[PDB]
A paper describes a structure:
CcP employs a heme cofactor to reduce hydrogen peroxide in mitochondria using electrons from its biological redox partner ferrous cytochrome c (cytc). The reaction mechanism is comprised of three steps: (1) reaction of the resting ferric enzyme with hydrogen peroxide to generate compound I (CpdI), containing an oxidized ferryl (Fe(IV)=O) heme coupled to a neighboring Trp191 radical cation;16 (2) single electron reduction of CpdI by ferrous cytc to generate compound II (CpdII); and (3) single electron reduction of CpdII by a second equivalent of ferrous cytc. CpdII reduction is coupled with proton transfer to the ferryl oxygen, with the distal pocket His52 as the likely proton donor. Here, we use an expanded genetic code to examine the impact of hydrogen bonding interactions on ferryl heme structure and reactivity, by replacing the N–H group of the active site Trp51 of cytochrome c peroxidase by an S atom.
To resolve these uncertainties, we replaced Trp51 of Saccharomyces cerevisiae CcP with 3-benzothienyl-l-alanine (S-Trp), a close structural analogue of tryptophan that cannot serve as a hydrogen bond donor, using an engineered pyrrolysyl-tRNA synthetase/pyrrolysyl-tRNA pair (PylRS_S-Trp/tRNAPyl), which selectively incorporates S-Trp in response to the amber UAG stop codon. To gain insights into the origins of this reduced ferryl heme lifetime, we replaced the redox active Trp191 with Phe in CcP and CcP S-Trp, which allows the CpdI and CpdII states to be differentiated spectroscopically. As anticipated, the X-ray crystal structure of the CcP S-Trp W191F double mutant is highly similar to that of CcP S-Trp (1.7 Å resolution), with a secondary structure superposed RMS deviation of 0.17 Å. Oxidation of W191F variants of CcP and CcP S-Trp with H2O2 (1.5 equiv) leads to the rapid (transient) formation of a CpdI porphyrin π-cation radical at similar rates in both variants (k1 = 126 ± 1 and 122 ± 1 s–1, respectively), as indicated by a substantial decrease in the Soret intensity (maxima at 406 and 407 nm, respectively). The CpdI states of CcP W191F and CcP S-Trp W191F subsequently decay to a neutral ferryl heme (CpdII) with rates (k2) of 24.2 ± 0.1 s–1 and 6.93 ± 0.01 s–1, respectively, indicating that the S-Trp substitution stabilizes the CpdI porphyrin π-cation radical. In contrast, the S-Trp substitution decreases the lifetime of the CpdII state, which is stable for >5 min in CcP W191F (k3 = ≪0.003 s–1) but decays with a rate of k3 = ∼ 0.07 s–1 in CcP S-Trp W191F. The feature at 791 cm–1 is also observed in the CcP S-Trp W191F double mutant. Despite the increased reactivity of CpdII observed experimentally in CcP S-Trp variants, PCET to CpdII is thermodynamically less favorable in CcP S-Trp W191F (ΔΔGPCET = 3.6 kcalmol–1). In contrast, proton transfer to the reduced CpdII species (ΔGH-transfer = ΔGPCET – EAII) is 6.4 kcalmol–1 more favorable in CcP S-Trp W191F.
Numbering used by the authors: 0 to 294
Write the structure that this text describes.
Amino acid sequence: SMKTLVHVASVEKGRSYEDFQKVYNAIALKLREDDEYDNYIGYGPVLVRLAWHTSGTWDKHDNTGGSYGGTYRFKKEFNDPSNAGLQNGFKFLEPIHKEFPWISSGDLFSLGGVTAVQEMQGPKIPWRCGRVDTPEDTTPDNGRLPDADKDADYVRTFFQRLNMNDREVVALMGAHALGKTHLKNSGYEGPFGAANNVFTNEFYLNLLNEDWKLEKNDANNEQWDSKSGYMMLPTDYSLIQDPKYLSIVKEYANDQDKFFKDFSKAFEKLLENGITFPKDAPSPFIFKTLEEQGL
Ligand code: HEM
């Protein structure tokens, strides 16, 4: 591999907590307003998916990809087959960026995910500013995001590239409490769980408690379906097939607070992988929800 690239965080000129809380608020207000999307699930889940896809390209071996450069705005990454459907999240963020043109693309994509998690009643995610747009030729090639038709050994190896351990993997996957698979996007179809747009630990409870059947969907792909009408990907279900993952699933199924704390740590880490924060950078921001502000 090549010598690691160095990506030093640089605060948008003159900006501070209050500026980023205003961007958060605009995202949160649009989440509330544009609530018809995807049969009234709203844009929360796709924004969290967008944050994972734009951060999940990172390669610890050469520090390519990751959230820093905001490269999803370029054709090669925008048109990654793995990114099908994310254009809806990008379009959601367009008026936000128009109102706050000074925020970097990487800061906006990652802050979109933080805002969505918190506004869906998830844990506070501390968030740092200072990602800087990088040129088109820094865009990572397609193929760095994970396949869903795979087992636990694949999941474990894949996430080593993001410097995630077993606990971080199981915690991050809890985001599949949110939203659904869409046959036209991914070859999988159905809601993951019951609430769809409230962040809870129901991913782990459903894995353990539902009666899952391995079925074939209308795209001829196998997926796990329950009589409650939920589905899980093969990679999701692998978390109760592998004995080490299963232990952690049981822990989170039995401790909502522990899941929230571990998810918040692993999600912040995901959004910050590859970034060098200078010694005198601002501390991470913890944004108030609209509810906490009375807005
Ligand atoms: C092995 C790892 C993962 C695999 C294979 C995977 C795969 C998928 C697939 C196939 C979909 C359906 C997309 C569609 O049809 O619209 C999806 C949706 C989603 N993913 Fe994952 N994912 C993984 C990890 C993650 C992580 C780590 C996060 C966030 C921390 C995340 C957040 C989401 C969300 C919120 C959705 C719902 C999107 C929507 O409703 O539009 N995923 N994932």
